[PDB]
Amino acid sequence: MNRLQPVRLVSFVTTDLAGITRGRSLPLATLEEQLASGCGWVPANSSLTPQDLIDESSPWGSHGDLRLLPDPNSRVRVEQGPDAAAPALDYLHGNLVETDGTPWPACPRSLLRAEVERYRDSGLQVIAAFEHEFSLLGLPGERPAAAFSLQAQRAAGQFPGWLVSALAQAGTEPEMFLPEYGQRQYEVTCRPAQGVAAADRAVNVREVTREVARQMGLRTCFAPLPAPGAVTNGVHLHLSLQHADGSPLLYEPGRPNDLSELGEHWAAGVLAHLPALCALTAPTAASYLRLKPHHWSAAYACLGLRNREAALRICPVVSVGGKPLGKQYNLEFRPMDATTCPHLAMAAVLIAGRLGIERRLPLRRGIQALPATLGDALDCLQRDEALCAELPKPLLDTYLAMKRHELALTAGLSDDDLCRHYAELY
C-alpha cells in the first residue's frame, strides 16, 4: 500500500580526549523526551586510548556512570548525501555531567566552554576556524595528478560538490575546497565561529567528510602522516580576539606586524607554553612523525609574519580590492593535527594565551624546541604547573594516564608501522 521508511535515528555525541566522537542514538520521535535526560555514558570511556584499551591506571573503574546531555544549539542535520538511499546524518553535541546535573570535570566540551566564559568575563569573544587536510582514498582513474592541480580536483569526481553541500547542510559554512600538496590530499576550510561552536565545527567538518566518503565507497584519512614518506595532514587553527562588539583587539596598524599590546601578550603565552601545548595539540604517538619529520628538525616555538616554519603565524590583512582590514586579522597556530579533540585542543591554546595576557608576558635566546615524541610532550605538560593548574585536575590525570598507555601500546614499533597503525584510526 505504502513502502515503509527506515526510522531516522538521532545521535548524542561527545568527542573524547582521544579525539574520537562517540555516542548513542534514538528514534527521532523520542528526541523531545530525550533532550532533558540525554543518554547514559560510562566515565571509563574517557580512559580509552586510540587502540581502544583502558588500563587499570584509570581513575574511573567502579565509579558511578554519567549523563551525556545534548546541547540543542549544536545540532547537525545533513538530510541528503551522495547516496540517495542513505540515512540522514543527525546528531547533537553534548556535555558530560553526573546524574544530578553536575558538570563532569573530565568533559572536554565543558572545559572549553568554561574557558570561553573566563574569556567573556574579561571582555573577549573568541573567534576561530580550524583548517583540515585529509587523504581521499579509493578514487577511480589514473595515478594521482600534480599537487594543487585542476586535474586533481577533477579526479575527485562528485565528491567535492557533495562535500561542500553536505557541510553547507550541516551548518558548517563551507567556503574553500582544494587539492593540496600530497597525493590524494584535499583541504576544506570554513567560515570562523565564536567559542564552542568553533570546535563543534572542527568535529562536524571531520565527521561529515567521513560520511560523504562513506556514501561514495571512498575512504578518508586525517592521520598526521597518511602513509610512510607522504606529505603530512595538518590542522591549523586561526584565532582572532574581539571586544564583545566585533572590534578586533588583536590588531593595531602602525604598531609593527599590526599586533596589539594585548595581541603580543596573548601570542607570548602561547609561545612560552607551546612545548606543553604539544601534548594537547599534537597528542598522539603518530603526531611526532609530522612535527619532527626529517632527521634532526627539532622545530621551534617562534613567530612569523613571513614563513611557515613558524609555530605561530600572523595572517596579515588583504587590502587589494575593497576589504575590510582587521576583522580578517588573526593568528594561526600550526603544530596541530586531526588526532586531537577540537575542544581540548582549542581550550589548551586559549589557556596559555590567557596566561600570556594575565601576566603581561613580553614578546622576545628566549625560545624553546617543541618536543620530539609524545613522551617528551607529556614530560613537558607535567613540568608546566602554570598550565596544568588551569586544567580541571581529573582531566589531567585521566589524560596523562591514558596517553602513557597509548605510548605503552605503541613502543618498539617502527616509525612506519606506527604511521600505518594510526592511518587506520584517523
Ligand X SMILES: N[C@@H](CCC(=O)O)C(=O)O
Q: CB of 82 within 8 A of CB of 163?
A: no
By beta-carbon distance, which residue lies closest to Mg ion?
187
**Could you tell me which of 72, 48, 60 has the C-alpha nearest to residue 98?**
60
Q: How far apart, in Å, are the Cα atoms of 111 and each of 98, 250, 361?
A: 15, 24, 24
Residues binding a copy of itself: what is the number (CB under 8 A)? 92
Residue written as grid cell 593595531: 252
Residue 232, contacted partner among Mg ion, a copy of itself, ligand X, none, CB below 5-8 A by kind: ligand X
3-state DSSP assignment of residue 388: helix
* DSSP assignment letter at 306: S
Site for Mg ion in 174-213 (CB under 5 A): 187
Contact flag: residue 52 with a copy of itself (CB under 8 A): yes
Quote the CA–CA distance of 361 and 384 in Å, as a whole number: 16
Site for Ca ion in 274-293 (CB under 5 A): none
Q: How far apart, in Å, are the Cα atoms of 103 and each of 47, 108, 231?
A: 18, 11, 40
Contact flag: residue 133 with ligand X (CB under 6 A): yes
Residue 52, contacted partner among Mg ion, ligand X, a copy of itself, none, CB below 5-8 A by kind: a copy of itself
Judged by CB, which is closer to Ca ion: 416, or 424? 424
What the block records as the C-alpha cell of 122 is 574579561
Contact flag: residue 63 with ligand X (CB under 6 A): no
Write the CB contacts of 219 (distance below 8 Å, at least 6 apart in sequence): 136, 137, 138, 213
By beta-carbon distance, which residue lies closest to ligand X?
234
Residue 295, contacted partner among ligand X, Ca ion, a copy of itself, none, CB below 5-8 A by kind: none
Among 145, 388, 409, 413, binds Ca ion (CB under 5 A): 145
Q: CB of 191 within 8 A of CB of 185?
A: no
Nearest distance in Å: CB 358, a copy of itself: 32
Judged by CB, which is closer to ligand X: 306, or 383? 306
Site for a copy of itself in 212-231 (CB under 8 A): 214, 217, 219
DSSP labels, 157-192: TTHHHHHHHHHHHTT--EEEEEE-SSTTEEEEEE--
Write the CB contacts of 393 (distance below 8 Å, at least 6 apart in sequence): 105
Contact flag: residue 243 with ligand X (CB under 6 A): no
> Does the annotation place 424 within a ligand binding site?
yes
Site string for ligand X, 191-230 (x = CB under 6 A): ----------------------------------------
Q: How far apart, in Å, are the Cα atoms of 86 and each of 5, 6, 143, 304?
A: 11, 10, 30, 45
* DSSP assignment letter at 190: E
Up-side HSE of residue 391: CA atoms within 13 Å toward CB?
A: 29
Contact flag: residue 177 with a copy of itself (CB under 8 A): yes
Among 220, 232, 287, 339, binds ligand X (CB under 6 A): 232
> Does the annotation place 207 within a ligand binding site?
no
Q: Single out the segment in contact with ligand X by CB under 6 A; choices: 108-116, 149-157, 192-200, 231-239.
A: 231-239
Quote the CA–CA distance of 187 and 185 in Å, as a whole number: 7
Burial class of residue 143 in the structure, from the number of CB atoms within 10 Å of its CB (0-12 exposed, 13-18 middle, 19+ buried): exposed
> Does the annotation place 3 within a ligand binding site?
no
What the block records as the C-alpha cell of 283 is 597528542
Q: Single out the segment in contact with a copy of itself by CB under 8 A; choices: 19-27, 260-268, 370-378, 380-388.
A: 19-27
Contact flag: residue 129 with a copy of itself (CB under 8 A): no
Residue 243, contacted partner among Ca ion, a copy of itself, ligand X, none, CB below 5-8 A by kind: none
Q: CB of 75 within 8 A of CB of 97?
A: no
Judged by CB, which is closer to Ca ion: 134, or 266? 134
User: What residues line the site for ligand X (CB under 6 A)?
Assistant: 133, 231-232, 234, 290, 308
- Residue positions in the annotated binding site for Mg(2+)? 133, 180, 187
Site of interaction with Mg ion (CB under 5 A): 187
Q: Which residues are annotated as a binding site?
A: 133, 180, 187, 232, 236, 290, 308, 334, 424
